[PDB]
């Protein structure tokens, strides 16, 4: 198992997609038109997971870029990165999405999902070993959102026993686009509980504070918002993408990470916040990697409890000392990790560092104060369908008001589920 | 591609047409004999304002329009015009006997006479298109044909065209310029037959145009022209969108899911500045945060009510110029504490924000000055309602004696179309009533 196929949905999901085909493209020393031009041979040693290797050794992304409206893919083509992305993987409609999970997920998008899959499958048949699926994505749009978690149950269908994770840019009204977006999330949140093993918790609200506050950055624009995602996406994939001895996959990590099925929703974290001079020590990294404000999903991990944590160590740096330090927030702060789960926080180092920090530290919880996420779309969805509010864009494309309070009850039990073992 | 076609129907909509044309070709460098030197694809192309202009292979730029009026005399004054040349001959479509202000003969007798025509002549515009998103249907409230054969028009669209959007810009009626003593009857009836079949109407009170008029440019009897001018900015406001790219413009269907709660519930108040004439506005620049604070001075209202003594369900502020988000921010930061800005409790408090870089341009020997920066509020208040009472009233006291009814019945209508149109006005204002209200 080596191969993964990468799957970028909608607005959002290709522009941060991009960022992270920019970021570790750049790791792995492979320029803009596909050519390899680094010095390491640990840059190409894993470089299968992510990439095909082409006439005249050119290394293509395995990636596919999905969208309704031609807009977004036509700036990618333009942008930095754009040449190295197969042509054929570019699939996209021309009417658009509407920020309606409906046109995304039953109509519109309906329309163009078999010819997306029909390259999934052409990436698939031609991996050795195919051990999963990554899906970029929004679920306040349309397309992300709806189109996204369609493909999801598509890929599932055809694919059921692979792995399938999704970076998922939870919405916020402090950087939102429209007032439909928590109908849209809570849709899609019912979906992502059946059909993904892993979905990493990306939240809009906590990139804007991260910018706003701890990077201050007074008016923060989407792409200072991808800076963080596209580091976090770098850092959780940083063990696939580089040796060794102590290697990974995805199902391991799946199987480790989540003690029940439906709780696979979790909070990532990076250490330092960029946008520097001074190198942190381990004791900063690991201080900061917990902190709640370096968190990407706005939630307060003293309101919850740790089910599980993976933290993975970039750098040079002494082993002993990651270790004692992660044993000291472990034995110093015990009440805030499960105890039925024994030894439930697994670190890695990894020697290798991201562009510019001589040593990072990128941080994984599954934590049970995820909840509050699920918690304040629960409540701006229910202030709108409590009154039917702006329904009348879903009852247009098919859509019923039993589905919706379906979608509004499994993410209720979802949140109940969480506090169960918060107690417990 | 995303086309929009747009028809303008009587006087009202013909004359707003000029304007709202006229206004275009200064925004995209086009001639008046259609020529676009900045346009280097010729005889087709994808750019932005493309969706409002198509192209011969001579590099003619045709407006995506139609003009229709029962009665020759103000599409002739287009046909002999400066932008003779701009238009072919069938999009301009004229009958010769008009509707009489009588929606019965433009909606029936008259108006019958002409709609097959009409279709099929935006048919041909329709089959240039390789993605039409919607039609922009410019029309007066109070004229025969622009309340009657609107209807019957909007109607034969929803057939046609399924529901492929439907925009109107509906012209209230008001004493101080032109009225007629029917334009209530013409107004309710209208507004009733069209409600179901119009996706969003942006409604234009012309004492709201007239008031600004006076006031703020400093004209003392202004005239259509006058008004005209200033209404064919703030339809240049919305439409820019459509017209221009943008890295942080946000498209108009954008701003209207966020505008039509329930659909019935479609009719935006527009708010528009700066209006200055430019003796005031010499060695005067109006900053982000004044344009802004006057998008919630009501005096600059495109109707008149009052959004201060009502509840809002949206807002969204489309800046065009010399704007960047930061101002913006600062701008409604200011305002949020300073104004009476209550929203409905089921709806989220944001404003929405757009911005075009293109600076608003002004028509050459206008009244209006030329600015750096502007901005059109587009807001969803209860308080419009206000606007369908006044209205409402004025029905009643004559519906109440029958008064001028035998112009209607004998030309086909019923007196059930009056009630049946009158109810359906008062189920509006009762949901204009209930929506503001709050939950349990
Ligand atoms: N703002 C503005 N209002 C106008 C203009 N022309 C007419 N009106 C208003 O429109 C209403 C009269 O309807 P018109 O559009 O002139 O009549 P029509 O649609 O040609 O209908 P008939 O002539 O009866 O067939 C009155 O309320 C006028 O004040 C104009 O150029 N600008
Ligand atoms: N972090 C981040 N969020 C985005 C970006 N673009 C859009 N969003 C968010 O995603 C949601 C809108 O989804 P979008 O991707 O525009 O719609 P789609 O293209 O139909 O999937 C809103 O909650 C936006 O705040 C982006 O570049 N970065
Ligand atoms: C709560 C314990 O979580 C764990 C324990 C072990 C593993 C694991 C096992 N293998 C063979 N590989 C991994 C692993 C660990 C990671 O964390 C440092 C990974 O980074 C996210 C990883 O990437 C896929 C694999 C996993 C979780
Ligand atoms: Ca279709
Ligand atoms: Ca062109
Ligand atoms: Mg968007
Ligand atoms: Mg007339």
Redesign the interface.
Same mark, same amino acid.
């Given at each position: 198992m080596r191969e993964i196929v990468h799957i970028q949905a909608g607005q959002c999901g290709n522009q941060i997609g991009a960022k992270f085909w920019e970021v570790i493209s750049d790791e792995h020393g492979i320029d803009p038109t596909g050519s390899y031009h680094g010095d390491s041979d640990l840059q190409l040693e894993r470089i299968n997971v992510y990439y095909n290797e082409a006439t005249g050794n050119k290394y293509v992304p395995r990636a596919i870029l999905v969208d309704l409206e031609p807009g977004t893919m036509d700036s990618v083509r333009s942008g930095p990165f754009g040449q190295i992305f197969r042509p054929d993987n570019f699939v996209f409609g021309?009417?658009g999405a %509407? /920020? /309606?999970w409906a046109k995304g997920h039953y109509t519109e998008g309906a329309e163009l999902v078999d010819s997306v899959l029909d390259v999934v499958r052409k990436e698939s048949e031609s991996c050795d070993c195919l051990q999963g699926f990554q899906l970029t994505h929004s679920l306040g749009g349309g397309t992300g959102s709806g189109m996204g978690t369609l493909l999801i149950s598509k890929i599932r269908e055809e694919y059921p026993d692979r792995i399938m994770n999704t970076f998922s840019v939870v919405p916020s009204?402090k950087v939102?686009?429209? =007032? =439909?977006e928590p109908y849209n999330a809570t849709l899609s949140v019912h979906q992502l509980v059946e059909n993904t093993d892993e979905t990493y918790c990306i939240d809009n609200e906590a990139l804007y504070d991260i910018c706003f506050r701890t990077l201050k950055l007074?008016?923060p624009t989407y792409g200072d918002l991808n800076h963080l995602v596209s580091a976090t996406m770098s850092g959780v994939t940083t063990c696939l993408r580089f040796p060794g001895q102590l290697n990974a996959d995805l199902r391991k990590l799946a199987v480790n990470m989540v003690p029940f099925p439906r709780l696979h929703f979790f909070m990532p974290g990076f250490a330092p916040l960029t946008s520097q001079y001074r190198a942190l020590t381990v004791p900063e990294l690991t201080q900061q990697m917990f902190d709640a404000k370096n968190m990407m999903a706005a939630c307060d991990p003293r309101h919850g409890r740790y089910l599980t944590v993976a933290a993975v160590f970039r750098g040079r740096m002494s082993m002993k000392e990651v270790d004692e330090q992660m044993l000291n927030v472990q034995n110093k702060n015990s009440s805030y990790f499960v105890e039925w789960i024994p030894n439930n926080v697994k670190t890695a180092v990894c020697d290798i560092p991201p562009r510019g920090l001589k040593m990072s530290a990128t941080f994984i919880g599954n934590s049970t104060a995820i909840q509050e996420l699920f918690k304040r779309i629960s409540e701006?969805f229910t202030?709108?369908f &409590? &009154?039917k509010?702006?329904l009348?864009?879903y009852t %247009?494309e098919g859509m019923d008001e039993m589905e919706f309070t379906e979608a509004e009850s499994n993410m209720n039990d979802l949140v109940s589920e969480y506090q169960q073992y918060q107690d417990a | 591609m995303r086309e929009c076609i747009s028809i303008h129907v009587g006087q009202a909509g013909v004359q707003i047409g000029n304007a709202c044309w006229e206004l275009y070709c200064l925004e995209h460098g086009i001639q008046p004999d259609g020529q676009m030197p900045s346009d280097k694809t010729i005889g087709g192309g994808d750019d932005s304002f493309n969706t409002f202009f198509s192209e011969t292979g001579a590099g003619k730029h045709v407006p995506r329009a139609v003009f229709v009026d029962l009665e020759p005399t103000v599409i002739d004054e287009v046909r002999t015009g400066t932008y003779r040349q701009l238009f072919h001959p069938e999009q301009l479509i004229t009958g010769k006997e008009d509707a009489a202000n009588n929606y019965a003969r433009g909606h029936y007798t008259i108006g019958k006479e002409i709609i097959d025509l009409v279709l099929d002549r935006i048919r041909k515009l329709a089959d240039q298109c390789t993605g039409l998103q919607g039609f922009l249907v410019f029309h007066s409230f109070g004229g025969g044909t622009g309340s009657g054969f609107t209807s019957l028009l909007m109607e034969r669209l929803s057939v046609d065209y399924g529901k492929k959007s439907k925009l109107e810009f509906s012209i209230y009626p008001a004493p101080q310029v032109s009225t007629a003593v029917v334009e209530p009857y013409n107004s309710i009836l209208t507004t009733h037959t069209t409600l179901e079949h119009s996706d969003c109407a942006f409604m234009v009170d012309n004492e709201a145009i007239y008031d600004i008029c006076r006031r703020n440019l400093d004209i003392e009897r202004p005239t259509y022209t006058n008004l005209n001018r200033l209404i064919s900015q703030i339809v240049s406001s919305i439409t820019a969108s459509l017209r221009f790219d943008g890295a942080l413009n946000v498209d108009l269907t954008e701003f209207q899911t966020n505008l039509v709660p329930y659909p019935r519930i479609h009719f935006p108040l527009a708010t528009y500045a700066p209006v200055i004439s430019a003796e005031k506005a010499y060695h005067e620049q109006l900053s982000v945060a004044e344009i802004t604070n006057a998008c919630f001075e009501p005096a600059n209202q495109m109707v008149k009510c009052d959004p201060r003594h009502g509840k809002y369900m949206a807002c969204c502020l489309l800046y065009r110029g010399d704007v960047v988000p930061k101002d913006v921010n600062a701008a409604i930061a200011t305002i949020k504490t300073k104004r009476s800005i209550q929203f409905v409790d089921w709806c989220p408090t944001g404003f929405k924000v757009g911005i075009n870089y293109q600076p608003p341009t002004v028509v050459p020997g206008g009244d209006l000055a030329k600015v750096q920066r502007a901005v059109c509020m587009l807001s969803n208040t209860t308080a419009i309602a206000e606007a369908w009472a006044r209205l409402d009233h004025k029905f009643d006291l004559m519906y109440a004696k029958r008064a001028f009814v035998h112009w209607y019945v004998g030309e086909g209508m019923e007196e059930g179309e009056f009630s049946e149109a009158r109810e359906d006005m008062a189920a509006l204002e009762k949901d204009y009533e209930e929506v503001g209200v709050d939950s349990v």
């Open positions: 021309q009417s %509407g /920020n /309606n009204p939102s686009d429209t =007032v =439909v007074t008016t701006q202030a709108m &409590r &009154r509010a702006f009348h864009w %247009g | -």
